[PDB]
Spike glycoprotein (Severe acute respiratory syndrome coronavirus 2), 98 residues
Amino acid sequence: VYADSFVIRGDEVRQIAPGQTGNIADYNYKLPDDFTGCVIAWNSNKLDS
Amino acid sequence: FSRLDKVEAEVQIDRLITGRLQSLQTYVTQQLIRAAEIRASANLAATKM
């Protein structure tokens, strides 16, 4: 099992899904086509901001 | 490929391979019927000669 942690903007959460393209899914972190597993996202306005 | 997401494009492409494989199957089956009919007629010309 592997775990990857990073902080992004709310609008780009949809790009982390496999196959999406954009400034974050093509330049920082791109998932493979046959990805097995899944992702978890939650708002963190209190601490990081 | 250029109009669907890569996560689910593989579902549609195999959904198209089935038609191009079934269509080739019906052609072969029809020939097997015709070949037996010609075979029964080539065995009559051999007797007639």
Summary: Chain A touches chain B through five residues (CB under 8 Å). The two ends of chain A are 30 Å apart (CA to CA). Residues 12 and 24 of chain A are 7 Å apart (CA to CA).
